[PDB]
Design a binder for this molecule. Sequence first.
Ligand code: HEC
Ligand code: HEM
Ligand code: HEM
Ligand SMILES: Cc1nc(C)c(-c2ccc(Oc3ccc(OC(F)(F)F)cc3)cc2)c(O)c1Cl
Lengths: 58, 422, 240, 374, 98, 80, 444, 65, 73, 21
Amino acid sequence: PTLTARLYSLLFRRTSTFALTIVVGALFFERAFDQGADAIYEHINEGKLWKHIKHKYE
Amino acid sequence: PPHPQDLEFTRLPNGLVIASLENYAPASRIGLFIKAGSRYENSNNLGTSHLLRLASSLTTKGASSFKITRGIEAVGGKLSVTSTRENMAYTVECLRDDVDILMEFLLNVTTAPEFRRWEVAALQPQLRIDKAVALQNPQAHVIENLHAAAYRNALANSLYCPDYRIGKVTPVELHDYVQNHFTSARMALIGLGVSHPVLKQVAEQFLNIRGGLGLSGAKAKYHGGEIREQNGDSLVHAALVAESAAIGSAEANAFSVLQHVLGAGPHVKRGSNATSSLYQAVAKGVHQPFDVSAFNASYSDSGLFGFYTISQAASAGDVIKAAYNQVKTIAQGNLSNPDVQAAKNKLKAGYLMSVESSEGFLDEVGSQALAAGSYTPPSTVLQQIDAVADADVINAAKKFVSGRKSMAASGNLGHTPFIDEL
Amino acid sequence: DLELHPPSYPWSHRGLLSSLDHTSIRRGFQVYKQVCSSCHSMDYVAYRHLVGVCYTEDEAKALAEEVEVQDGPNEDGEMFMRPGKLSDYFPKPYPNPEAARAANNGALPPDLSYIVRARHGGEDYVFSLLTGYCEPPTGVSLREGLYFNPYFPGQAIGMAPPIYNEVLEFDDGTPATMSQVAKDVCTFLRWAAEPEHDHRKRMGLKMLLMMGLLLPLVYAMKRHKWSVLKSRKLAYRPPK
Amino acid sequence: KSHPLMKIVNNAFIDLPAPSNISSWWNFGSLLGICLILQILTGLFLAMHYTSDTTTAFSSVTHICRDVNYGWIIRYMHANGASMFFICLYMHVGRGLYYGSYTFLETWNIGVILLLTVMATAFMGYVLPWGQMSFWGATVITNLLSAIPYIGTNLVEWIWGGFSVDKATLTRFFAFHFILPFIIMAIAMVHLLFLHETGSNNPTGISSDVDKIPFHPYYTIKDILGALLLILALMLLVLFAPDLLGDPDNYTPANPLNTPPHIKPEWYFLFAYAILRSIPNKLGGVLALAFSILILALIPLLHTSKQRSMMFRPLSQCLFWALVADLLTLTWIGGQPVEHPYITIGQLASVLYFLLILVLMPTAGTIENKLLKW
Amino acid sequence: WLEGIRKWYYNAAGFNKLGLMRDDTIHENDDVKEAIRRLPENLYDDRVFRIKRALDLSMRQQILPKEQWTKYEEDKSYLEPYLKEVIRERKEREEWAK
Amino acid sequence: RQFGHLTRVRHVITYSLSPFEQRAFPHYFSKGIPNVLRRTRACILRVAPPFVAFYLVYTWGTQEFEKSKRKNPAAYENDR
Amino acid sequence: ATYAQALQSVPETQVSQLDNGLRVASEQSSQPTCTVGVWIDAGSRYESEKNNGAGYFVEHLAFKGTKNRPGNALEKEVESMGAHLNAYSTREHTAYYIKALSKDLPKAVELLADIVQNCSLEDSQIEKERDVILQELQENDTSMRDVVFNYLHATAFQGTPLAQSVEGPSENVRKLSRADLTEYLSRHYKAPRMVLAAAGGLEHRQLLDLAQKHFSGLSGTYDEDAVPTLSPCRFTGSQICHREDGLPLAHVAIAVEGPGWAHPDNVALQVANAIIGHYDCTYGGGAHLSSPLASIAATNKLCQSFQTFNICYADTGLLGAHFVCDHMSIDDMMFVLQGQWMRLCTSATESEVLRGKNLLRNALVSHLDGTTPVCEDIGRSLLTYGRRIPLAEWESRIAEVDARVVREVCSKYFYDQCPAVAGFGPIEQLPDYNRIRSGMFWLR
Amino acid sequence: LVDPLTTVREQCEQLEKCVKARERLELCDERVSSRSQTEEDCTEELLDFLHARDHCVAHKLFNSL
Amino acid sequence: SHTDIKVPDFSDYRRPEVLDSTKSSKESSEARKGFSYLVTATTTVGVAYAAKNVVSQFVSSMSASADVLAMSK
Amino acid sequence: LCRESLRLVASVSLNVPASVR
Ligand code: HEC
Ligand code: HEM
Ligand code: HEM
Ligand SMILES: Cc1nc(C)c(-c2ccc(Oc3ccc(OC(F)(F)F)cc3)cc2)c(O)c1Cl
């Protein structure tokens, strides 16, 4: 079986498990994305933010 | 194979026939045959048979409309009802372990129906359906008419309720009709795949109701004559018959043989019906799609015999005459011993096949059981076929060509002949 | 009736994902507190606002207690001054427009809270104004109290050129040039007028990536559904 | 019990027979709903913190942006949402003009009402924060009514509740601004109630009862996608260019003593401001500005082609895009000061607008028929 | 000459690209609705299909191959003779009411 | 009005296919791009001239507004 | 004398073979009449695009006389002796059979061997059956049942041989020459790809020696890579919607991919199909019917007739239902039907299974009542299953089917599967495919 | 201490358009200065210049800061 | 005849995995469904993320502003 | 209904259609 084919019969077939998947997956996704793109932005604007220049004034 | 059994037989004190082949099939098949067809409908309570037929499984004394329908379906049984112009045949089927439940529901339906005003009124418009579904076949028209043209009192009556009466049948008329015609002297209990002790035991206990024919039929005064329903179908159907003789006389057999001489039906798929005398006679002046076959009706009271024509629009005049001529030149006596010997095989085999499956068998056992006294094994029938001489056949054809005529036609009847033009 | 439009000075925060430079905000703040807090009100900012932006809580509170602000009324029903605290909004140069004008030859120095968004060009203008002062060309005289600035409209501003080299000295010890001051105070004024600015642009990134992800996925579903109709085949078969 | 009976009133959202071939121009009504609901939702949350008094009205909005949690996103979604509404509106009305949908007279005329209602709402909305353009926008726009002879001068004062746009006005404008949306949402349901009598038009202009499809699942998913795009367009403005469609003067609190230099109604009104300024006469201007919007109600009586849609109508097709381009021109001309050459470009664009609609577009349709032997 | 312009316009309008006859595009309306009712089985059934195919095309956003386009020369005015009557009968109905 | 009651259609056959049995984005660029280009070709001369005309009038009236705002020209004029 | 025991007393069908291939098959009862006939693996699935509709042509010609019996002799010899001669073609099978008297069995068996082997195929007769069949195709054109079922096939098995009708496209009928038919015949009527079945009054070995007498002389073996193999036919989730409004009633057929003659599921699927059952307006039951679809249909007149089916072929089938109904009742009829499928898949009550089991039990016993039935069972059982199967085995297999099975089995073939849909008539209401497809899954 | 600005202006007003404008400034500036009671200035020209200069100034001033 | 009616050929539009008209679809359906139902499930997740975020913002709108928290201390 | 290959007892039941023999 393919990944798609296993994914179908293990998680998408029963509408119960389908929903649970979306939930689990969305919790997992949320953190990954948030922290990923937070990181991309923080790099894109490296040096400039109060979290980068915090240490100096403590 | 297993070991063939005697179709047992009894006739209780009050004239009630009982019969039971125990052929150890997995299935059990039980009929209760009753003399209550169209013939016993008077000139007022018409259709009451027809409604009564549909009315199986309306609430009864011991079982509700629900319990009946769902109870049988719970074991996958079946409660059929089969009417002739003479006999009603309430017939059950099921596995041989359920026989008593199906027997039970059968007796309630026959001995103990309530016919509740609000159920019977609700059932009425089914007549409209069941009738229209059946008059799809243009034959039904023609045959219904034919009896109404031929006979008057009893057998002129249709199997399907007349128009005006649809709705008008009262629950009193059912009570009345059942009470008067569901009686021990008019009933035969037939069993296939069941032992004789239990069929008796139940018959004694729960079918012993008033055994006094509450009405009797008439003697079927044959009239004769013609009914013609002009209606523009592509084809034209028309039947022409004459007073034949009743079933149970050796004169019936001669007409049966006379039938398979003339026309029986297809025996070989897609053939040209080479042997069929009628088809072949009318095969030759007329070059078109057409059909003809030998009509042979035979009841206890009387009988019909002649032919049925499904011709073209304008070929009606030709086909009906051409076919008539062919029967005439049999009455005049052109019948080789080969032709009687072929027909005797057709019939001998045709009968033997028609009781092969349990379905036909039970209908013949119950047919004999009511029509006259006890079972007449196949050998005697096959023998009686042989018994018919080659004179009796030509005398049957002589009785037709000379006899009083009944014609029933429907189609576009512009080029259709009348009995006096024939 | 002629007007000179600003140029496009490229700030560290110009590009669509580029954040403000909090060090330069920090410096800019001092430029306000030292150079302009004596004529320009910044009515909608308070010391707490600075915390976590360009100052610590302690630094900010120390910045607060640096000022005497009025409070009251007390038990006797009388108003009294007290040292500032985090929740105090930057103190006001005057009591009212009439006072502010009467002190400056009739002209009222506008509030700087929203000045960056209240003017076309924004910091590219304010910068250009602050540094762009120059001499009246042959033909142009001016009233007393008016100075010629070509970036201002009507070229006759009532603001004395407010920054020259080393008008103050910064905490971190950057070269306190004129153009290096204007840059920092403009970077600050931007934050003053738009505190959301860094966060907004970060959300913007998340929105872009998210639409990135969804907008094809949905289009896909739409297409999956409509396939049935887009693919179909018709056939007219009349008889005779 | 189950309430199972009037979900079966979504026989006009699910099993509704729709045409197979409506293009993305039919996506716009839905969006206008999203716009309306969005605006309402954000408006309510803004109303939780705003105050209609002149002393605090500016101060409130700032407090919303600065100190109220995420108040700034809400405030800008609201203000840019107002623009997205009007974009969606002008697309939506265009569709109707091109494809001749104005034949659905009721639905159309109810439309022309809705439009006015939304203009009226948004006009008051922009007064609420009490910035310089908020005030002078109202003073200058409203005053137009006193052009109306005899009564107008009294009528204007009644509107205002005084002798000037004042605290007395700002409060009621807030009040009305809050209410109208709902009257709009009611009328909208009627607007649909009439449409569903006939079902939608399509781009051909040819009765599509021969080829219909269930609204669901087809046009639901089409519309979800469509909304997602609008949400993109909105969020780009809100998160990247939040003041792009705004005037900066409105970031300085209103002052009835010092008039701004270039006073101008917000962008979606500029086309009519131009038409108004074309005409030298005061009343003439007002009547012109009125006609400039209400002529939408005349349109159905000016139809002439025996074909419904412009799809199969070349001449008309051009004149249409000429109209759109002229609107774009008038919109530009309305944004500029009233100096050469803008006043003459103004004139001609204005005369061109009305000439197109009343004279040329109906003629195009007539000729068009003569060329097909109609 | 006019007949050159007519020919041009016909092909510019470009209903033909969808295999539609002129009288398939006519604006539905009481008279038209009536004329159409009077049409015979074949002429009606045809129009139904021409339109059923034209809509399907419009949905897919495509047109017919150059060859299957409706051709000016061959373009039947099938609805014309029927409608003219429907109209005249109504003009008579109005005249009489005057 | 709903399915069953819309209108009378005779002698038409529709063949269709499961979304699961078929491709979502068939011949997307293969047959898309040319179809798009034909479509753009179809309409372009009806749509674009009005906007081109806008572009001309825009830049003209703008740079022309800028002339009239500028200055005067004989090199002597405000005196003599 | 129980049901369990009654299955013991059933004659174990006896089967022999020949060196030349022909399997011989017979079940003995003491019946005075009997049925005997030839069963063959041939038809429109083995046919192909150019020769389609030939098996029907041969079946037509086969009774128009052999070489040893010219003209209408073959006909008259059978007619006159009393017996009956019939034949039929399907997509995967062909049978020619005779009902006769026991005594005639020897004479009967002879004629069959002549029909199969020594067929005339008169060139004058070919053009006679050419006009016949062309008119037999116009007949079917007005029999919505037959039309819809052929459409269902066409769009269920599109692009493969099964998609083909048994009767063949009206073109082929008009352009098939002797060359094609003779070839078909000699290439497909081979002795190992055939069975000789009979039942009634006869002893197995009387048949076998008649088979050696008349069927040893048949093509006894085959050549190497000419006797064909069957390609698996792809099932395609699709729809075919013949919208014809002038017809009084709409016929629809919907089905998902069936398992195939082979698979043991075909019992639990028959049990399941028995639960949903079947109906028409002339049934007595009305509202009191056990099948909720039937009772709903009856009280509300959703339809005037509906029947579930399991059409089986070699390595696939059609497992679905068919209904005839009013132009406005289609959606509802569909909704209830799919409802029932999903109800079975996700919850199948215990007793309602026990109802199905018994209905099926009843069905097969009361189906095999006669000779013509049992001869036909034997004739195909060998051509498909490889053997014949005792009612006592069918019983065992049925008795193992319970709730959990019926569900797993129905869930297996129905739940979330693309169905194939044929609709003929005033079907403007017939739901959209995208809608119907969502009717195949759950938790709405 | 010296300002990065006061260098970048010097270096920017080398370029051809600045000197060309500065020329026109002098040139009409003369004309305006040397007469009696004419009413113009060369403000326009000043701005013409300043624009040309400051476009440049802005293009690099910020590297020093 | 109605048997002239042959279904047209969809091989232009089909999925690769179901092109061979002599190969059973039953293998690939497993993965075909999975693949399409995946798109849906992702789209749902993204939307859930998106929704969770706009809601909670609008909610947080009503908790004490920094203005009111200033004095809380 | 069809045509072209042509060469009483009523019956009704509870599970069968009605047949006309
Ligand atoms: C002691 C007085 C004083 C100081 C110091 C001062 N200003 Fe001003 N400013 C004014 C006055 C008076 C105006 C009047 C503007 C006018 O001419 O109308 C003004 C005008 C302005 C404007 C003009 C608004 C506009 O659109 O033209 C800005 C911007 C401005 N100042 C910013 C600043 C900044 C930044 C600083 C220091 C970092 C500063 N000012 C220091 C008195 C001052
Ligand atoms: C239905 C369409 C609506 C439109 C087109 C609309 C339009 C506008 C506009 C243009 C503004 C000025 C925004 C600004 O410059 O900041 C505004 C402000 C406002 N609107 Fe609405 N609005 C609508 C509905 C609502 C509703 C239903 C409410 C409340 C229930 C509401 C409440 C407000 C409030 C409180 C303001 C003032 C805050 C601010 O300046 O942003 N609006 N509206
Ligand atoms: C709040 C403002 C409005 C809303 C929410 C709204 C909503 C809708 C919706 C949802 C539809 C169905 C979708 C469609 O066909 O596009 C529709 C159709 C229509 N609306 Fe509007 N509408 C508004 C304003 C207007 C206006 C101002 C006009 C005309 C001046 C108008 C004219 C129409 C017409 C003619 C149709 C149907 C024509 C067709 O089917 O092609 N509407 N409206
Ligand atoms: C023919 C046709 N009909 C309708 C109804 C729609 C249609 C209209 C609106 C839709 O969503 C809505 C969005 C906001 C709404 O609010 C309000 F109540 F305020 F309106 C109501 C509905 C969704 C679909 C459509 O897209 C087409 Cl093509």
